[PDB]
Amino acid sequence: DIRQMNKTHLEHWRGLRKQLADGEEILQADHLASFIAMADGVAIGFADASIRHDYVNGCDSSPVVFLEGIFVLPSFRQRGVAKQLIAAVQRWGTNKGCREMASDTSPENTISQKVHQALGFEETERVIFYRKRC
Amino acid sequence: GLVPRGSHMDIRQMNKTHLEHWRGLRKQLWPGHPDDAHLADGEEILQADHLASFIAMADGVAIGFADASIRHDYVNGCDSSPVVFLEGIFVLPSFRQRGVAKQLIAAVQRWGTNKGCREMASDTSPENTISQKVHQALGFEETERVIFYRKRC
Ligand SMILES: CC(C)(COP(=O)(O)OP(=O)(O)OC[C@H]1O[C@@H](n2cnc3c(N)ncnc32)[C@H](O)[C@@H]1OP(=O)(O)O)[C@@H](O)C(=O)NCCC(=O)NCCS
Numbered sequence: 001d002i003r004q005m006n007k008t009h010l011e012h013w014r015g016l017r018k019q020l021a022d023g024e025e026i027l028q029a030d031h032l033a034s035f036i037a038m039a040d041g042v043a044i045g046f047a048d049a050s051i052r053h054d055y056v057n058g059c060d061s062s063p064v065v066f067l068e069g070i071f072v073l074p075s076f077r078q079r080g081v082a083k084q085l086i087a088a089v090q091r092w093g094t095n096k097g098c099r100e101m102a103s104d105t106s107p108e109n110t111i112s113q114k115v116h117q118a119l120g121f122e123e124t125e126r127v128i129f130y131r132k133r134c
Numbered sequence: 135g136l137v138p139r140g141s142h143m144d145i146r147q148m149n150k151t152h153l154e155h156w157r158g159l160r161k162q163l164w165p166g167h168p169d170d171a172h173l174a175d176g177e178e179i180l181q182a183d184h185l186a187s188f189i190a191m192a193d194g195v196a197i198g199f200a201d202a203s204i205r206h207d208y209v210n211g212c213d214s215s216p217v218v219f220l221e222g223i224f225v226l227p228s229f230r231q232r233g234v235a236k237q238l239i240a241a242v243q244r245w246g247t248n249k250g251c252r253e254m255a256s257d258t259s260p261e262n263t264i265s266q267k268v269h270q271a272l273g274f275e276e277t278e279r280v281i282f283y284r285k286r287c
């Protein structure tokens with residue numbers, strides 16, 4: 001049971017996000033989309049996505065569908081829920097015209113890295129990001 | 135009016151006349167791209183409102199440059215949007231450690247702010263220790279390290 005998020009789901013979505021305002025912008029925006037997995041009417045997993053038009057490390061085409069975040073409640077892990085949410089994200093990206101899908105994860109997130117490889121992604125590059133307020 | 139500025143080292147916003155020298159330098163930052171691709175990049179940068187490059191001129195000769203963009207996409211480690219991102223920066227070996235990059239970045243920062251950016255960001259490879267010391271010495275804070283993934287769709 002996978003669905004594109006709407007206002008009803010906003011509440012369940014926040015609880016999971018808290019574990020991994022915006023729901024507002026996402027609902028309103030065209031380049032934004034979030035998906036949710038339900039067990040007995042309860043959101044037990046989600047994935048946030050966006051269509052990126054700026055440079056994306058490791059990608060040579062534009063726009064790109066970017067998996068901004070993904071989370072599945074510990075107890076529902078290893079049942080294919082993420083594989084399903086990512087396939088929904090891919091479908092959405094592909095018909096918004098993206099020829100490639102991208103994602104990122106921390107060097108310490110070993111399970112995440114294995115999940116990305118198991119789902120067909122290829123590591124492109126590792127980078128350190130910086131920031132300075134103007 | 136007591137101290138003329140940029141009498142010998144001057145930071146300029148790139149225009150069509152700098153295309154060839156910028157490209158000459160960019161091939162040294164990013165080897166592997168035909169003069170074509172650099173050129174196409176240069177025309178895109180010139181015509182797009184969220185894109186700009188800066189050229190460091192020593193007595194009229196380009197010795198460094200910085201490519202920047204006003205990013206509206208989410209930018210790792212930032213709380214606001216848009217962000218002025220340093221897409222790349224390069225200074226000829228013979229002119230390093232003289233404050234050039236400092237000025238290119240200050241000019242990028244300044245263009246970013248006038249375009250509504252509250253934050254400036256950059257990224258760099260974990261093998262580039264010199265670039266990591268450069269970012270820290272210039273006031274940037276490391277926000278996060280990540281691994282990027284790609285899948286054709
Ligand atoms: C990453 C995460 C979303 C995976 O969710 P999931 O529902 O458990 O994943 P799936 O069951 O759909 O697994 C997809 C594939 O990855 C593999 N995988 C999942 N968990 C794994 C683990 N712990 N170790 C090794 N491989 C694993 C599965 O074996 C599966 O393999 P297959 O396709 O070859 O059959 C989940 O661990 C989680 O929510 N973690 C916390 C948040 C986080 O790390 N997010 C990542 C980036 S924001």
Ligand SMILES: CC(C)(COP(=O)(O)OP(=O)(O)OC[C@H]1O[C@@H](n2cnc3c(N)ncnc32)[C@H](O)[C@H]1OP(=O)(O)O)[C@@H](O)C(=O)NCCC(=O)NCCS
Nearest residue numbers: 222223224225230231232233234235236264265267268271
């Ligand atoms: C990174 C680079 C642009 C810096 O250019 P630069 O003109 O030499 O830098 P600056 O002189 O303005 O240096 C500013 C700051 O970095 C420090 N710095 C510069 N080179 C350094 C080095 N090799 N080791 C340690 N610190 C260094 C300066 O000392 C410091 O300022 P401070 O003295 O006021 O504290 C240049 O080395 C270069 O082109 N590197 C190769 C390409 C590259 O790696 N680009 C970055 C990623 S796209």
